[PDB]
Structures are given as C-alpha cells and as structure tokens.
Amino acid sequence: GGMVAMVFASGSHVFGGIGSIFPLFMMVGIMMMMFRGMGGGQQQMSRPKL
C-alpha cells in the first residue's frame, strides 16, 4: 500500500482506473498464501493422503 501511496503522492496517477488491476490482483494473491496454503510439520494430514 505504501508503494501505491508513494506513487500517488509523487503525482504519476498511473494506477487510476483500470491500471489498478495490478496492485489489486497481487494483494489478493498474497492473501491466499498467508491464510490458506498448507499445514506444517504438526499437520501431516492433507487431501492427497486422507
């Protein structure tokens, strides 16, 4: 968010409108890895073995 804010304060205004699709999809992709993803050493169970 800081990168986008820095660019907006700088005045490029490149991310306005449809250009925003790059930050938006990245922010969503990061969200998937941190909350879901896969279990650790104490979570050996998974769909392929169950």
Binding site: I18, I21, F22, R47, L50
Partner: protein, 64 residues
C-alpha cells in the same frame, strides 16, 4: 428429519462430499469403483491450466 435444511457444516464434511461425488461420477461412465487411477481429476486440472494460460497472456498484453 436429519441432514435436511441449511444447518451448519465443517471443512471435513466439505472434502468428504467431494470424495463421494468423484467416486459416484466414475461409476456412471466406467461402471467400476476400483479407481486404480483417478482420471476425472486430471481432465479437470488440464482445463484449469488452459484458462490460467489465457489469463497470463492477456495480462501480458495489458502490461504492454
């Protein structure tokens, strides 16, 4: 009764149903439940790969 309506559910019940769905689906097309290998999965994954490759290319065009 039981099982009817919109009651609560859990994540183990969601995968459990998908297993019964795959196993019953091949029983209609191949008439056997042995399921030595599970081709329905692979045929579906290949489509998802096809769609993803289309999206990667058009995002590449927008970047241009």
């Amino acid at each position: 009764g039981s099982g009817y309506g919109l009651g609560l559910s859990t994540r183990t019940q969601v995968t459990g149903y998908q297993f019964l769905a795959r196993r019953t689906a091949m029983a209609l097309t191949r008439w056997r439940v042995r399921m030595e290998i599970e081709p329905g999965r692979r045929q579906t994954l290949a489509v998802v790969a096809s769609v993803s490759a289309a999206l990667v290319i058009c995002l590449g065009a927008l970047l241009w």
